[PDB]
């Protein structure tokens, strides 16, 4: 099964998930449009996570990060007054080091999420959406700037009036990810932000065409009128989307076949329909892994119907 | 007072210096031939070892990162068996990054200094011989490669059979370098490698002359036949220099006036007079920073002499 992941709201169901089915199984295509190059190396906010949550060092406590990483690097700048942009643990930093140097031998972001991957003796097949560069700049009545900057540097607090996610026109899907498309045919949107995470995975070239020919399943970001977590409320309004489970189904209208909102809005049935996909309510609030397990068995049952 | 420097043996006359004369009139020129860029962040091992001394921080046990540094970032790629090449300690990394970071926004090398300077707090005049880049390789009986590959990597032990200070030619005296030598007329070339450290600087193009209208003292880095430590001992001879206090004097013959050798080998004073520089022999094994100190003293009495 392959799963297109954020790097929060995915990879809560991804923590719940990888008890349901058998890891090798499940592949992720990680978003990208969010990486960075901070401090000299690249750093792969969506994707890293997702290799800290199956290498079962992800810090559950937010959702980012090694557990107990240590900030001597940080702290001591921390001292110097110098921002370095994102809270940085040691540990934490040598995944981008790592990733950085096979990046600066002409390797790849996917050979070094293998490399990676094969360190961190994960069963699982992560693969980012694509090997090109991909950057997503928020349009604020303040100015343009990039995602980082706006989410950590600025608390969300801009008003966003636009979103801009550059060079995904000219980005490829990895090769690796149109391989596993092809010995797949079960496709899980996981519940992460739909126009900054989703959005550039589906928006790469071919993407939504190859997602016509599979079964998509997708479990709505949106719980009520906002989303659980993120700036999910300010950039899809601003965006055109309306913040709803109904806008996230009408987002992937083009190949969305099964919808999996939550129970606190169960909608109108035949308003789905008319959108041509099943939907469905349950209990997305992912509040432990036996939710996120929980929820999991309801989206394998999905599939399976 | 200007003074060429190293990461040892410089830095260790400096530490009983700075007790003698007042810091802001210390202008310390470093060796940049030893920089190398490792984990997308430029080390400068001369450079830095200088402002740590200076910023009361350095690691007086092995003289160079520092003191009671954290491993985070090491260690951790320790686990995952990846050499770094060099072990860098935390906060002797945040070094790096800062130094990187502006050098990354469009300054230069001696910028980087400056800022690291006063964000140290030092009062002492910090300077990189050269804003261009220099690379100090050595010629072994296994292939030419980086000066710190052998040192550092083979343990120095590969047979040496040339050095090659690559970009030197082709380098250009520190702005600020050559603008301190417009205002001070003393200098002191201090007890490093005359060749991968005192030699790149001299060797810079318009160097070695401006050293002939100057006072310039020297203390010899190798007491007896072989030096206090450093690969000295190999280079200079497979360089075509004397492994003694007799070859260094020879060395900078074209515009050494005063030279420092220690005491532990009276050599013919009157072999130096006919050398063109006037011996003088003292206990230059400096012990701890009284040695410095004391050292020190010698040092500016054979100035104002
Ligand atoms: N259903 C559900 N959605 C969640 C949960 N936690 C976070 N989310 C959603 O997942 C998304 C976070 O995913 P991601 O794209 O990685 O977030 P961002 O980069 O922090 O903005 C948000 O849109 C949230 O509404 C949860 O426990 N349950
Ligand atoms: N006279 C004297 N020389 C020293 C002392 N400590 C180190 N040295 C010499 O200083 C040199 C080290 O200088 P440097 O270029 O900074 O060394 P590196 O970091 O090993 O490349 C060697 O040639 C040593 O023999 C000391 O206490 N007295
Ligand atoms: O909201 C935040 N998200 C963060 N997400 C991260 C993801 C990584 O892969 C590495 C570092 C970070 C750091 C932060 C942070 O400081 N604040
Ligand atoms: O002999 C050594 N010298 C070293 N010299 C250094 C100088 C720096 O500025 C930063 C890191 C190092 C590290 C080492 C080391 O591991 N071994």
């Known amino acids: 099964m392959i799963i297109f992941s954020g790097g929060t709201g995915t990879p809560k169901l991804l923590d719940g998930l990888k008890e349901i089915l058998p890891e090798e199984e499940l592949t992720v295509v990680v978003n990208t449009a969010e990486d960075l190059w901070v401090s000299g190396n690249l750093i ?8 800290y949550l199956f290498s079962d060092q992800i810090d559950r406590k937010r959702w980012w990060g090694i557990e107990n990483d240590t900030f001597g690097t940080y702290e001591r700048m921390k001292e110097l007054g110098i921002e370095e942009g994102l809270k940085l643990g040691d540990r934490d930093r040598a995944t981008h080091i790592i990733r950085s140097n096979i990046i600066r031998d002409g390797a790849s972001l996917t050979d070094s999420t293998v490399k990676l991957s094969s360190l961190f003796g994960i069963k699982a097949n ?18 343009i700037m990039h995602f980082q900057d ?3 540097g600025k608390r969300g607090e801009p008003d966003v009036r636009g979103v801009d996610i550059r060079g995904v026109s000219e980005a490829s899907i990895s090769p690796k990810v149109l391989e596993a498309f092809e010995k797949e045919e079960n496709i899980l949107i996981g519940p992460s932000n739909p126009i900054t995470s989703i959005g550039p995975i589906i928006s790469l070239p071919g993407m939504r065409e190859l997602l016509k020919k599979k079964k998509v399943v997708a479990v709505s970001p949106i719980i009520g009128n906002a989303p659980v977590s993120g700036p999910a409320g ?3 309004p601003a965006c055109g989307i309306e913040v709803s489970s109904m806008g996230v189904a009408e987002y992937y209208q083009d190949f969305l076949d099964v919808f999996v909102f939550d ?8 308003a789905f329909e008319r959108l041509g996909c099943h939907a469905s309510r349950a209990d997305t609030l992912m509040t432990s892994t036996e939710k996120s397990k929980e929820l999991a068995e309801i989206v394998v049952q999905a599939f399976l119907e």
Chains 1, 2 share one sequence.
Do not use: H, N
Request: without cysteine; hydrophobic residues 40%; negative net charge.
């Open 44 to 51: 792969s906010p969506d994707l890293d996570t997702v290799l």
């Open 263 to 270: 129970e606190r809005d169960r909608a109108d049935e035949f």
């Open 234 to 236: 300010k950039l899809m």
């Open 150 to 152: 706006f989410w950590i």
């Open 126 to 143: 992560i693969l980012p959406m694509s090997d090109d560069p991909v950057s997503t700049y928020i349009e604020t009545a303040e100015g």
